[model samples]
Target: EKLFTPLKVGAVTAPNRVFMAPITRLRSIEPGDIPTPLMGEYYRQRASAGLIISEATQISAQAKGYAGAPGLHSPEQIAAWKKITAGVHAEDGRIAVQLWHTGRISHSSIQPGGQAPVSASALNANTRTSLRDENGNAIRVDTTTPRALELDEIPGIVNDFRQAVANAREAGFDLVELHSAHGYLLHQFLSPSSNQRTDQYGGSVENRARLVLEVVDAVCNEWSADRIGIRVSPIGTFQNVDNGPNEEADALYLIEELAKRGIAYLHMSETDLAGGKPYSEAFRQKVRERFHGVIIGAGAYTAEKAEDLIGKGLIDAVAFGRDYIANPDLVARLQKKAELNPQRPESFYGGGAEGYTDYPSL
Candidate 1:
């Protein structure tokens, strides 16, 4: 089957096309946001997926937005992740950790020093983030307005990403993917609706894409471009951030530039998980034309749809998000045409073991 075919994505060859998309399960230990042994067990079980991209991890304290989400910035954090990565490697699974900054999609209560969160512009993200309750349970809360980043403050942001790459390497990851999707820090600067600035980092599509390219360059400096992939949502709004009037134009500019960099793969997040419309066929065709690398199509993909797209050559691989949480042996299940497990929606986040590693494999 095409879905079971091996695909070369940058530095690693995924034995199957059923890649596991990064899911924020909010299961990491807090205070320091360290990964737990349970997290290692969880990923180690899903090691059969073509490639496992870990949950979105903060690069620095200022990059954190959700409670229990892990970080890649500290020695303890790196050491904890090392155990998780070692576990995955022991199981012969290739793993990549996603690095991100929440930007405006964070509450002040979570920001460092309880300061205002930072973004491309000072605007309310119109989103919600997770916070721990008195009993250390995850609670949803609306995000606060963020302050615009000063021109001088931008370099430090880029350097934080570079440093995270260094940490990811030390933590024993096969690769690192920059999370520019879902209206996070890099996406905030890329989307026009949120980036209303008079400086060089705003206004035009090229200017908006500048920061992302800079971050890519910084990441590439510390790691090979072949080991670096980026996730981008081109078509739809997420967390109240839309691409604005020049949606395709803005997305194309970034994609074309990324193509020039010759990065290993382009993990295009076609849509969100909450029933958002998938990218139009026309745009998908356009994306195929722009980038000539492994394109992993993520979000709400089924084996049938994934086969169809792979057959058409629009995507080289598919990343199963929700199904992966419930079906650890997803590759085997698809290959044998077996029944799939049902996911527990209530236990999707902020829980331990019950829904995380309790999924049985065929």
Candidate 2:
């Protein structure tokens, strides 16, 4: 039972099977929301995990929704991230930047100069994001009338991702994952519930997926296909977003498109694992049937479950979010089959490193 067995991920090799899922704690430096020294230490402490997926780093000013999430669009931000990546690499840990754009899931208070949130359509989000008000109170962000992106603006969004990939490379990340899931910018377009446009970016499933594909191409143009990952939540209901009842079809189409690109891996979330069928098996089969690469599964996967899936050859690695949040030595615990530390929900967002970096590794 070698939990530390080497695994091939695209052009790189992960020394262990335990991977850290991107967890946003919003602990960036003040004012600029840049990656701070504390953020570097937070990640360096978790280098025990095979691969560390950095929390969703905003690709543009318009994408800054969460109060303290780091951005990669500036020289100062890139310099800060370089320090972080160097620290992680010193520990022999592989890291990847999760490029994120919040789209309509933003508040005017969070945007630079208090600008309005933007989306694929003019529709607003029913749910509030992790943004806060001036008085430090959690405010519900009403989805305002978003100015639709003219054809000219579409390339800029794609270019933001491409530039982010370049920035991640400059920061020394081993890979980069596009944040196309969990009701973010790319997910906003994918969710029929969020996108109701009649333009080419909407309507059919293929059309709705156009933006994501374009982003993939743009990002891969900067980073190699083997050095990129895509995270998608097909059935997630978080952020009040869903793919309707045809999720299996939508998931298939999405997998097919990502597979065609021969990207590094498809990071999928099993939001229905407790009540519904595990889609990872079907997804892995479909990916292997169509493309040849790695598959990483996330969502409430225990050590036993992870071992089961890996033993069954259905997935290459299992990503742990909350588990890793509370346990920096998650791989060691899994190898020993030890008890896990519980997570504190209240300190999940808009906090410093109290609950973030304070977690001890037994």
Candidate 3:
């Protein structure tokens, strides 16, 4: 079957096209925001995936938005992630760390020194993020109004990404995927609705893309471009950040730039999963024209639709999110046409082994 075939993605050869998408489980250790032994077990159980893009990890203390989400910044965090990477490698599975900065999606409670979160502009996202209650239970709270990033502060953020790339290598990641999607820091800079700056990092598509490009360049300096990938939601809305009129043009422009750098892959989150319109055929064709690297499509994908899309030349691979959560042996299940266990949405975040690593495999 097409999904079982191997494909070369950057520096690694994916044994199958069935990849695991990044999903935040919010199970990391507190205080240090470090990866735990339980997390290692969770990842090791799903090692059969062609490639596993890990939960989004913050690049700095200022980048964190949610309670218990791991970071890649401190020495302790890097050391903790080392064990998780080693466990995946022991099973011959490739893994990539998804690096991110939440920007305006964050609240001051999670920020360094209780400062307001930073973004491209001072606009309030009018969204909510995860926080812990007095009883140590996860609760959602309104996001804080962020201050506009000073022009001088932009380079510091880029440096954070570069340092995180360095940490990813030390933690033994096979690749690193920049989180430029879903209205995060990079997405906040990319969208006109979120960014009202009149500086070089705003206004035109090229200008808006400058920060991401600089980050890519900074990342390439630490490692070869082939060991890198990026994820973007060109038209999907999340946390009140929707696609503006020029979203298509802006995304295409970024794709062209990424293609020129010869990065390993481009992961696109389709709008369909968000209960919005899916990518138009014309836009897919347009993306194909702009980028020749590996293209991974995620969001609401079944094995059959994944196979059909690959056969149609629309995408080179598929990343399964919920299926991977509920079925550790999802690749095997799909291959043998076995039934999958239902995922418990209640335990999706801040839980123990019940909903995370306890799913039985055939």
Candidate 4:
């Protein structure tokens, strides 16, 4: 059994072993930061994978920290996401919604009452976030210096994650995956350079890993271990996040800890995100040894590479990002060995059906 085989992902069984990775398409332009109808259409088109991890859905507005993204904190948002999930299910697709919080990678505009974004430390992330003006137009701008999160606030944020998972269940998601990677809140906590606090939540590997495990435990309260997953950029250097000397080892340390929990699956963006960067075979082998659960390798993998890796037992499945944007029939193309459509980078972030739903299936 290989790439096209039915793979067990936690408690569920995906029809095939090609999973859809979450891509932040920013199509949620409706008021209240809820999902738009185009999102419903967008996912339904690519529902033939082993599973679909929906575009990262913020757990709260402050967690959103961007323009045109959806959240799960409100009843209105919950109700709206049901349409998207239901649409995917109507196509016999299994999907997981990524639960996220931007932490310090945000601005006052995205926060309630214009508060400074919170992080593991007071340092600025040196990255840009999406903001909107009075005219409701989109603007990309730098993030501000953030205040460190208080010890007392950790539980509240964890509770927010718990509540987000509960909302995901109510919104008809088959699963909920935490966004603990890519310089987001959880990754900040895991990185030694970004998380320099001396408290119980930082310093040591377990300490730096505490918040993530706490959130995972919180999310577990709402969903079973088999129905949950996590995504990580284990050796990522994007978003001005630290690539300090200890980061590689530190990142691997967190992976082993998560593996012991026996969650359904672990998705790693180890390669360049699209047609992307090369991954270390050494690290890939280590990840497979450390985690017995299903592992989905993402980052610019072509059909040949993904299938070859699965055949070699490096990953159980593969999650495709950018290619899925331009090829709704990606599975068919892969299965039939057909050429893929070229992606339009300009239309990747914001905009309507042009880049969102206009990609035709073969």
Candidate 5:
């Protein structure tokens, strides 16, 4: 299969079928969660991919959970992202900003006034989060006693996403992907194990998916549906939240709803396939049956596996996460069938460009 095949996502035309998935390396310019010039260079170096989905960027102060992660809420942050996007576009590469809200995964340390984390339910999952103190030391924070969001406060959350989409446009991003996957705020609402509410935002499948759908609509109103994308993990077992009993049904419902809005693409993460079974085949088929737009498969996809999926016409493109972290010229390497360099887990989190930009590519 030719990995360099052209693919159209919304109004944007990707030069190749290999796209880079959003991966957090925790290397923001300052502790204030701003994207720096170094980040611009980092992304600019990997412009060889057809498209690049930036790291999960916090939409507001309350939406932040991870230490050192970038935010798109501030004017300074938007200006910084504009520089990055300009560099990418100058290199002739397409890019998108991934809008993120951590919800219950957020720690009190990251929140303003040291307030507790917010979620769909008041209950906490006893999860531990990694936070950096003033000394820049990684400390484990317990995620307990989260405050459930008030019915009225829900609109504010949706507005945050809308503002982020506006910020992304100001930053010159060609597209925006809502971070509804990886057990974030939107995923928390979708998972029954996390949302134990008796209101309009929970119970039935349509009700449970209300928050995300509203967020999508709110964002698409500012950015066109062709410029919008959504990421999802149907069988994801991350962050103490599971898909519950109706996994396939809920997944299909979300895919169809997003398609109805004329979304550019659906980025699906198949964690189970990364471990063994390769569920991308069946999942992609199901999504294609419902969604009319592009399908991007992510999670532990090797060059061979990606080519296999493309050959089966199950997906329009493949997104590489960790591989892109270690290999900036990942598409070129895969095109030439070159050997890939191994990744170092030690530098996956904190630190400067030690293991981050040090990885060599032919």
Candidate 6:
């Protein structure tokens, strides 16, 4: 099938087109927020996927918003990631680190000195976050209303992302993806609901999208735009991210701009929650016209339907999240039309290996 054909993504070549999306499992170790050995093995087992986008990894300590999320800030974190990337490469797998900053989707306890989370605006996120108490018990808590970042602080944030991309390259990643989606820091700036500033970073689509472009440009200094990708949730309301009526136009402008920069691919997260709404063909066609590079569509995709999408030239590839968790040999299973094992929803996050590497490959 065409899905099994080699596909070029940036300077790296994938053996197939069934890629894996970034899934937030929160399996990293504590005391330093490090990647565990188990995480490496889990990725190694799923090396058969055309490409693997690692979970949303923080660019700095202040970027972390969830418990057990991995980071690229400290030397320890970078050193550990080296091993993880090396293991994946050893198995001939391609991987990219997803650089992340949670913005207001964070709690003060998760930040340094219990400081308020920084964002484009001072609006409160109508969302909850997970963290471990001092006793190491996992608990869910309300997210803190973040303070609007001063104009000068924006450069520091962009620099942090650039440095993290450098760190990712040092760790031997073949590529890097910017986490500008799912109501995170970049997404926060793009939406009018969260950003109400009167400065150059808000009020207009270009202004709102300014931070994302700044970070992208900075990241490109160390890695070429071809080795970089971006994910954006233009219509997603996740994490209390409210969008103005003109988000579709805003997204089109942002995506077209990204294309002009010659980024290798654009990963579009399903706008509405999975199964709640279907992707609009009209909307996708508009994206197709605006962006010429490889486009990967994710969320609620089946092997059969993904093939259909690819066949129609609608998208270059499909990224699976839950399917990859349940089937380490997902590509092989889909190729053979085999029955797949169901994913254990209860074990999706904060676990040892029950729902992680323990999934047997067919």
Residue-pair clashes per candidate, as listed? 0, 1, 0, 3, 0, 0
How do all models score by TM-score? Answer: 0.98, 0.93, 0.98, 0.95, 0.96, 0.97
* Model 2 vs. true fold: TM: 0.93
Q: What is the lDDT of candidate 3?
A: 0.92
lDDT of each: 0.91, 0.83, 0.92, 0.84, 0.86, 0.89
lDDT comparing candidate 5 with the true structure: 0.86
Worst ten in a row by lDDT for model 4 = 270-279
Give lDDT tens digits, candidate 3, residues 179-290: 9998999999988889899999999888888999999999988999999999998886866787678778878888999999999999998853547777887998899888
Clashing pairs in 3: none
**What stretches of model 3 exceed 4 Å from their correct place?**
none
Candidate 2 residues 218-316, lDDT tens each? 888787899989998886575677876687788788888888888998887767334455565665676556656777888888777777777887777
What stretches of model 5 exceed 4 Å from their correct place?
A: 272-277, 280-283
**What is the TM-score of candidate 4?**
0.95
| lDDT tens readout by residue for model 6, 56-125 | 9999999999998999989999999999989999999999989899999899987999999999989888
Q: List the residue pairs that clash in candidate 1.
A: none
Better of 5 and 6 by TM-score: 6
- Per-model RMSD to reference: 0.9, 2.2, 1.0, 1.7, 1.6, 1.2
Model 6 deviation from the true structure expressed as Cα RMSD, one decimal place = 1.2
Clashes of 3: 0
